[PDB]
Amino acid sequence: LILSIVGTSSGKTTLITRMMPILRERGLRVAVVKRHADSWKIYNSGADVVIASPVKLAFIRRVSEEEGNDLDWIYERYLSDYDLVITEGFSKAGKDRIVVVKKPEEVEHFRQGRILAVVCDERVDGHKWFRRDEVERIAEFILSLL
């Protein structure tokens, strides 16, 4: 499953990070794609880099514009083994999304794909509506989607 969590400036991050223990406890492997719209010397010289450590691996590579803006390429190439892929932002990709906002009027901004739910403290009309701190229920909602 690929799902976008989108909305206004750090409410999105808190939701993702707070839901994460619950999603992982159910046995999901999860990746999060965040778009920005030494090893540096090596990278800067022309090489893509893997940095390997006992418990963490990092891979930094040049991509063409067409690759870097292509969510489904990124997924097919590197994330095909994951149960759940969540984007933070990547709204233009038109994936089904959860919209996380401060004010209900902001929801309107994010109709670039299908709105599965809205997370807001104030009443949101016209959508399935979760309050920001209902992390368990929102996680359960995502688990239902699969």
- The residue ranges that bind a second copy (CB under 8 A) are 10, 13, 16-18, 20-21, 23-24, 29-39, 41-42, 44-65, 67-69, 71, 74, 78-79, 82, 86, 88, 90
Q: Tell me how far, at minimum, the Cβ of 138 lies from a second copy, in Å.
A: 14
Dihedral of CA 139/141/143/146: which sign? negative
Nearer to a second copy, 58 or 128 (CB): 58
93 binds, among Cl ion, a second copy, none (CB under 5 to 8 A by kind): none
| Structure tokens given for 109 | 């901004």
- Binding positions for Cl ion, rule: CB under 5 A: 6, 89, 91
- DSSP letter, residue 127: S
